[PDB]
Amino acid sequence: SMQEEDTFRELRIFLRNVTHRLAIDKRFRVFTKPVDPDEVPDYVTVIKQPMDLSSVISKIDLHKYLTVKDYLRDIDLICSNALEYNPDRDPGDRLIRHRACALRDTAYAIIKEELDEDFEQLCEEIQESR
Ligand SMILES: CC(=O)N[C@@H](C)C(=O)NCC#CBr
Ligand SMILES: [Cl-]
């Protein structure tokens, strides 16, 4: 229905706003673009589903997220990819892991404060209906 299309459009507006707020944070610059294969040619071999915030924006606009849970799966991938690819004790790896965990925690904290639970439940019930 048009009511359902309005619902998903509101979801995309909300997700674009959350994603923009993460992308402008200087801590998260490394996560705004895909890893460059030049610098890191073993990346695309270790990490089977690369994810970054530009990929997330593209997915929002392709109507790939019908719930906030589906969006958070991709935010969690940004974090888990960084924990897997950069697991060492040296400062460069610890800094990337801390920034990745912080991205993920920031996204979850914005959604806790600003997502109405009944809105998410409506999205889930339309998605389940299709
Ligand atoms: C996202 C990720 O895991 N990237 C690894 C390869 C990394 O060491 N990044 C440093 C930088 C920059 Br900007
Ligand atoms: Cl830096």
UniProtKB/Swiss-Prot annotation:
Coiled-coil ranges (or none): 108-130
Compartments, as annotated in UniProt: Nucleus
Tissue specificity remark: Highly expressed in estrogen receptor positive breast tumors and in osteosarcoma tumors.
Record-annotated disulphide pairs: none
Description of how the protein assembles with itself and partners: Interacts with ESR1 and NCOA3 and these interactions are enhanced by estradiol. Interacts with acetylated lysine residues on histone H1.4, H2A, H2B and H3 (in vitro).
Family: Belongs to the AAA ATPase family.
Protein name (database record): ATPase family AAA domain-containing protein 2
Species of the source: Homo sapiens
Species lineage: Eukaryota, Metazoa, Chordata, Craniata, Vertebrata
Gene that specifies this protein: ATAD2
Full protein segment contained here: 981 to 1108 of 1390
